[model samples]
Target chain A: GSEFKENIINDLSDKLKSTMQQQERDKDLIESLSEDRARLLEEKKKLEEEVSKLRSS
Target chain B: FAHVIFQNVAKSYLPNAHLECHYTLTPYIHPHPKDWVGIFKVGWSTARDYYTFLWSPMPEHYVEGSTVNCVLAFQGYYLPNDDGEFYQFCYVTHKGEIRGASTPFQFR
Candidate 1:
């Protein structure tokens, strides 16, 4: 409710931008999650290969 | 019978947006404490048709037979997320009757 007129665009625009920022932050978070998952898998595979070579040789 | 109409409604709004509804109550009477203003999809037939609602404010004072104005604020993020639905505003009595209906609006 308002006793006087207001320009709604200014306030609505701020709320819209806040949502955009949240989306950008979430984009980075998901990228990091995927990158870490693949890195850990690659490390495990490399360690197993080294163990196999040392044991058989 | 009560006449209610929201004159400040917009034709369209963002799915996540802030909205303010300005309505004039005529005949200069205070509204019922339990009456409500609700957003309902088009083609709705009953009071159960609202997607969301807010209880109207009861003013403390008013001049009889004059027009009284009130506003209802709909905050962003709390609004409906359906871009496919055409909706409208309805003023309902506490006894569950529709007193007023606004023009169709979109959340696109």
Candidate 2:
């Protein structure tokens, strides 16, 4: 829920800016998690490739 | 029988409109002795349409330095009992060795 001031553009701008800064922090956290996920995917791919190579021998 | 409400402290919620109670035994009443025994009991009383409660620990007094002795009981009756007596039960804390039954028991 939110309350809005009819024409207080400056206050609205400040509030939006504050919210965007918080969102940026969230994005940073997500990006860190994404890096870990990417590493896991790479490991999985490597394991799959190794399995296939063994089967072909 | 009258209802006795016991509490760690007085003035808090009595548990329910029907009946609620609580209580704590302090050292001052039962001075800290090498060994002591006591019991807490609760008394209950109810009128034709209303319930009342009271609670307290027993062995009101003991050796000056003996640990406090306390037994508490609480009985509440929402409706009057068949015998016209309020429902009640007593709880005994049992024998205890207290560091010291000073005026005020310290808490960390």
Candidate 3:
């Protein structure tokens, strides 16, 4: 009957939506980690410059 | 630790006067999936000129002792005027570690 088919379609659509959401979350996590590392590297460079200046002083 | 080494560097000048460079890279450890691998060239003169001729994403999980071979070709439009001109080639890792041949090769 049409009712049974509609129920199956809704169940499948829900599963697809959940899967897509997880994929997006995983992508966001990767991007966050990348940004963190980049910021740390920049900080390290600044620290190195400061240390050099201190040593020369 | 990660490192890249270049070996078996061979160059040939074709009858048509094209310059071709061939070399191999041996990795010391399994390269990470995001690692970058490439070749850099430095030209020798009054001052050295450096440029990266090739850059590519390294293979995911490239095992140690495995060799990667690469070939590069250049036209004669930039050929050196003197036979004494030479260049240095080095294989570089994303981590900034590099290994190269002991000496530069003649450009003639």
Taking the candidates one at a time, how many backbone clashes does each contain? 0, 28, 0
Better of 2 and 3 by DockQ: 3
Per-residue alpha-carbon lDDT of candidate 1 for residues A1-57, written as tens digits (9 for 90 to 100):
563334576677888899989977865664465345435655766898999999999
Question: Could you give the TM-score of chain B for each candidate, in order?
Answer: 0.88, 0.23, 0.49
Considering only N, C-alpha and C atoms within 3 Å, which residue pairs clash in candidate 3?
A: none
Per-residue lDDT tens digits of candidate 1, residues B1-108? 448867978888886667887887877345788989988778777886566678998866756676778898875543555556678888988889888899988888
lDDT of 3 by residue, B12-108 (tens): 2322256655555555554444333322234322111232234534554666778775555644433332334344555444565554432455544
Give the winner by TM-score. Answer: 1
Error of 2 at B93 (Å): 76
Q: Which consecutive 10 residues in model 2 chain B have the weakest lDDT in total?
A: B99-108
The lowest-lDDT stretch of 10 consecutive residues in candidate 1 chain B is B75-84
- Candidate 3 — which residues are off by over 4 angstroms? A1-57, B1-16, B29-52, B56-65, B75-83
CA error at residue B81 for candidate 1, angstroms = 1.6
Error of 2 at A7 (Å): 6.3
lDDT, residue B106, model 2: 12
